[PDB]
Design an enzyme around this catalytic site. Structure first.
Site, PDB file in Angstrom:
ATOM      1  N   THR A 249       0.827  -1.205   0.000  1.00 25.28           N
ATOM      2  CA  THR A 249       0.000   0.000   0.000  1.00 25.28           C
ATOM      3  C   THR A 249       0.861   1.255   0.000  1.00 25.28           C
ATOM      4  OG1 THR A 249      -1.576  -1.271   1.332  1.00 25.28           O
ATOM      5  CG2 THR A 249      -1.995   1.087   1.044  1.00 25.28           C
ATOM      6  N   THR A 250       1.857   1.303   0.887  1.00 22.71           N
ATOM      7  CA  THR A 250       2.749   2.453   0.951  1.00 22.71           C
ATOM      8  C   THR A 250       3.559   2.615  -0.329  1.00 22.71           C
ATOM      9  OG1 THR A 250       2.874   2.018   3.328  1.00 22.71           O
ATOM     10  CG2 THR A 250       4.440   3.602   2.426  1.00 22.71           C
TER      11      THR A 250
ATOM     12  N   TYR B 194     -13.179  -3.657  -1.645  1.00 21.21           N
ATOM     13  CA  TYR B 194     -14.300  -3.206  -2.466  1.00 21.21           C
ATOM     14  C   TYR B 194     -15.411  -4.242  -2.633  1.00 21.21           C
ATOM     15  CZ  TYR B 194     -17.060  -0.905  -6.024  1.00 21.21           C
ATOM     16  OH  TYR B 194     -18.093  -0.314  -6.715  1.00 21.21           O
TER      17      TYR B 194
ATOM     18  N   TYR C 237      -3.172  -9.493   5.851  1.00 24.55           N
ATOM     19  CA  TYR C 237      -3.199  -8.059   6.122  1.00 24.55           C
ATOM     20  C   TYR C 237      -4.654  -7.635   6.254  1.00 24.55           C
ATOM     21  CZ  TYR C 237      -2.405  -3.012   5.673  1.00 24.55           C
ATOM     22  OH  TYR C 237      -2.379  -1.652   5.888  1.00 24.55           O
TER      23      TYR C 237
ATOM     24  N   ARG D 251      -9.701   0.515   4.765  1.00 25.14           N
ATOM     25  CA  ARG D 251      -9.371   0.591   3.347  1.00 25.14           C
ATOM     26  C   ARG D 251     -10.158  -0.393   2.498  1.00 25.14           C
ATOM     27  NH1 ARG D 251      -4.769   3.333   1.453  1.00 25.14           N
ATOM     28  NH2 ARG D 251      -3.363   4.114   3.089  1.00 25.14           N
TER      29      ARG D 251
ATOM     30  N   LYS E 244      -1.022  -8.970   9.706  1.00 24.69           N
ATOM     31  CA  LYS E 244      -0.689  -7.574   9.899  1.00 24.69           C
ATOM     32  C   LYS E 244      -1.969  -6.855  10.293  1.00 24.69           C
ATOM     33  CE  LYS E 244       0.563  -3.454   7.210  1.00 24.69           C
ATOM     34  NZ  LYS E 244       1.402  -2.840   6.210  1.00 24.69           N
TER      35      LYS E 244
ATOM     36  N   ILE F  90       5.124  -3.762  10.436  1.00 26.47           N
ATOM     37  CA  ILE F  90       5.306  -3.385   9.044  1.00 26.47           C
ATOM     38  C   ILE F  90       4.984  -1.900   8.999  1.00 26.47           C
ATOM     39  CG2 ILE F  90       4.468  -3.596   6.696  1.00 26.47           C
ATOM     40  CD1 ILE F  90       4.019  -6.618   7.375  1.00 26.47           C
TER      41      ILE F  90
HETATM   42 MG   LIG Z   1      -4.059   6.428   5.819  1.00 32.09          MG
END
Ligand SMILES: [Mg+2]
Ligand SMILES: N[C@@H](Cc1c[nH]c[nH+]1)C(=O)O
Ligand SMILES: N[C@@H](Cc1c[nH]c[nH+]1)C(=O)O
Ligand SMILES: N[C@@H](Cc1c[nH]c[nH+]1)C(=O)O
Ligand SMILES: N[C@@H](Cc1c[nH]c[nH+]1)C(=O)O
Ligand SMILES: [Mg+2]
Ligand SMILES: [Mg+2]
Ligand SMILES: [Mg+2]
Ligand SMILES: [Mg+2]
Ligand SMILES: [Mg+2]
Ligand SMILES: [Mg+2]
Ligand SMILES: [Mg+2]
Ligand SMILES: [Mg+2]
Ligand SMILES: [Mg+2]
Ligand SMILES: [Mg+2]
Ligand SMILES: [Mg+2]
Ligand SMILES: [Mg+2]
Lengths: 297, 296, 296, 296
Positions: free
Chosen positions: A46-47, A110, A136, A141, A165, A206
């Protein structure tokens, strides 16, 4: 029994220059992580804006991560999640054929699968490779949460699945997980509460903050794993301000801004729909950064 | 502005042996045409868009376009993505393939800012010359298109003509149409179809209409004619099925109901979606009994 | 600052025929003292403070004060209210009747602003000369005492020495103790007693300790002695009972458990509180079987 | 069933030097009467019910009852409490003092179960012979009266004739009237007055009507006559003030606006309520300038 990847881990940003992955900066950033005590790196998560990376850029960043960490103890935990099971299986196999030590696999986003669907989703992923698989959970999100029962069942039923995670702001669930399945590896997915998760038996982080301050997140994690909770808590308390400001806007907008402000990346470039922060939040990030000792290369 | 409004169906995508049942897809779409539906939405959320291949995605848009030729029914193709360059590609694709417009959901998972959402949709809108309908569903995306962002996009980009709202927030729908009454507010939540239409909404993109297209079509057209007593009466009658169709994550219940009604051959999903629980299967079957379902 | 910390119990209020069972109340407090508890909280949420008469409120505080004479166990009396002049009266009342300090929950229902919360608690703190512990439970009150407001109140008012946190938000507990490490953070959620204590929390105000005072007091004292291994293992065994004690709104499950363990004579509540569902009654009974309940 | 419906005002309680301004209270009610309002709600949330003394509570009900004698305007007295025996006393109090009916908010803070809420309201309804309107506002109380519980109470108790909803949940308003269309659904959220009325709601209990009683009254009566185009136009016109009146917790903005309009003499609240921030004070003043505010 299980093959695990734990300790202090960094969710790597993906630096762009003129719309392209800055490959020597990517390598330069990982070596900086290695030299500051980091135990594993997470490319194309994601990062790292995996959602907007091309197939090839995805392969380039995994391969750079794998090669840069060769001859060191630092593992490569590749991002491989997807909301389509056949896609996630392909990403898992992809990370395996390109030298990753394990995979992080985010809960389907989603499309909101049921708990039964999540079990079949991750079972298919775990059977597709022979390397560790870390779940995760980030419901803010994804719109979905992997329940404690589902995580535990997956941990017990599939060899490769060794933990989760957690980025749910729910320390109750972290107690729930480790009280009913103490053998699993609970990994902090929220920097601000790194120490509370580790002090309850979590075995790693993480980290987003470790992109900027790898030495401090590394020391924090290792203090906690060695049960020096006073020193682990002291770094967690000191890091609170930066841990919060790094989510002034959706990650990785603040961390990339900070990395750019620190001169660690050349351009403040994102891939749409991500973009530069507001000028107010730009100033807030720069202001908060001033209290921390930021290691160079 | 060119618009696509009225009663619209978020088409399910039937699978047969893990592969897209193309003939049933066409038969289901015409079944929609014959029951008063004004537009169909291929390869959207209810169509398991997320798990279709590129080819399947192309196949279902092409089938929809083809089936609607020679009718008044428009094709509003699913084209959203959480990557702007991917969403631009999907937009161009639907245009190049004969779609009358596109539905483009707010970026999911990566949580763009309002500024990013504006740039995201501006790039999509400039990439084609067909109507673009925004889709706000924060429970699925983790993100919200603010009222201000929706209104700015409507005013700045010729193609953006409204928003599909699936937020359970009738306050936001008042906010939208009170400050920008020219936009096309589209119901994205079947249970509150009538409240949205009665405040000036101009259409629905329905899950229930897969099963009961005649009732959703009548509801919408009654409401558009300001026959609010008859629109509300259909909305009230539909509440029980409208709720049970989300007993589990859509499209799990609607596909179950379509299968129970004999309208599709297999209760097949693409993982991570799967069959409902045995209890919810029975609950869906139980609620269906109070409704008259049209065959083919 | 004068403080009241350690293992503390939010006392249930046993009823018999719609009346406070004074004998039982003293006997239960008796039992807490003998099992390592450092303080008791009469007339709080778990004691159904909201529905007690003036007389009953007075009765239970005085019984608590009387029963703890000649021991180290303090009386931290419930004294919060959503009306500042009422909370001041309750604070003064608790002091006049021998309480060692007061717990004062954030105003409920009327949702004051942070500025109002500051003025609310300053008036309470100036009304007495005994320690004041703030109680933040937004799920019940509709309001939050922000970290900044708590810290300002701790620094500006002599008597305010910390906060009871029942917010399911360990981030806020990090926030609180990282910016004001001198305050006394008290766990208000039994399931996360250890994480709060392991971050520098200095006590718990427990629901579970009504049933299992020995285990809650050992957990807290282990953690306060920096034996985090032994604190964590007691926290882990207690998880199942800690969760089931909120299957329904506290104190419905804890009173049910106290009745099932034979520690109170009647399963009586004051309306609008009531007996749990028969399903949850059985669930509480089932979870209890793994635990060793101390008698009198 | 005997009902109290139409345009209704949740009366603010003006204070002057810490005391209820009795003359201003009566003058404010007369202003409501003269501007088409059908009923007034003394000693409710907007009237700072939680912080009034017993004497003031009774003084404000009696002033309301007296001021509405000889008019078509009914008095729907606030009478809720989170303690059933206290709520019963408040119900009998309002009945014995000439109120036409009672508003009774769901118990706050102690989070009763649905069974407990049923027994709570059944006891209240049996205690008086005047209409009882439920008030559901989960954001303030921490609890929700389920649709099933509301419907059961409506069917099992004569005095219970509907519910005042402040939940931002138009789905629930469909649910309520689709399964029990005989109940009186009353809007408790000014911004969505029209959507609630257009779905069959039969009145509002409004905060905005304190400032703009003529506009809220016209909205309701237009809507009750099925003049939805004209009702929606007032609802859209009122959105900005309807929103700004909750910039801070009600009744902080409405009292600020009433004071800015010269309708009350002092901007006084009872703690923990207080003056708004300087920023929100200016924002309230700015939005007010777009509206025609009637004097006395
Ligand atoms: Mg954020
Ligand atoms: N944008 C899609 C597809 C994708 C993944 N990575 C790159 N593209 C997703 O986030 O799942
Ligand atoms: N599964 C990814 C990519 C994709 C879209 N359609 C098919 N695959 C997504 O949901 O964005
Ligand atoms: N029931 C009201 C008043 C009260 C307090 N204690 C007893 N009665 C409240 O909870 O604030
Ligand atoms: N403040 C308490 C008691 C009270 C009611 N009215 C006046 N005082 C409550 O809101 O329940
Ligand atoms: Mg094992
Ligand atoms: Mg230590
Ligand atoms: Mg879309
Ligand atoms: Mg209290
Ligand atoms: Mg004093
Ligand atoms: Mg509870
Ligand atoms: Mg509680
Ligand atoms: Mg009269
Ligand atoms: Mg009331
Ligand atoms: Mg709303
Ligand atoms: Mg009528
Ligand atoms: Mg008329």
């Amino acid at each position: 029994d299980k093959n695990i990847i734990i300790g202090a881990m960094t969710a790597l940003i993906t630096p762009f220059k003129n719309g392209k992955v800055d490959e020597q900066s990517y390598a330069r950033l990982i070596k900086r992580q290695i030299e500051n005590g980091i135990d594993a790196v997470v490319p194309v998560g994601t990062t790292g804006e995996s959602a907007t990376l091309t197939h090839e850029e995805h392969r380039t960043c995994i391969e750079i991560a794998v090669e840069t960490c060769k001859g060191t103890k630092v593992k490569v935990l590749a991002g491989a999640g997807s909301n389509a099971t056949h896609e996630a299986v392909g990403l898992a196999k992809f990370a395996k054929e390109h030298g990753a030590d394990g995979i992080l696999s985010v809960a389907p986003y989603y499309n909101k699968p049921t708990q039964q669907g999540l079990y079949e989703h991750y079972k298919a992923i775990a059977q597709s490779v022979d390397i560790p698989v870390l779940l995760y959970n980030v419901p803010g999100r994804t719109g979905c949460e992997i329940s404690t029962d589902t995580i535990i069942k997956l941990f017990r039923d599939c060899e490769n699945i060794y933990g989760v995670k957690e980025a749910s702001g729910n320390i109750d669930k972290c107690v729930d997980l480790l009280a009913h399945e103490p053998r699993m590896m609970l990994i902090s997915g929220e920097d601000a509460i790194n120490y509370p998760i580790l002090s309850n038996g979590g075995k790693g982080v993480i980290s987003v903050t470790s992109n900027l301050l790898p030495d401090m997140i590394s020391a924090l994690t290792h203090f906690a794993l060695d049960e020096n909770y006073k020193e682990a808590k002291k770094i967690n308390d000191e890091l609170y301000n930066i841990n919060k400001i790094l989510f002034c806007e959706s990650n990785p907008i603040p961390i990339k801004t900070a990395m750019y402000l620190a001169g660690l990346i050349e351009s403040l470039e994102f891939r749409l729909p991500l973009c530069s922060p507001s000028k107010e939040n730009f100033a807030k990030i720069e202001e908060v950064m001033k209290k921390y000792k930021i290691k160079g290369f």
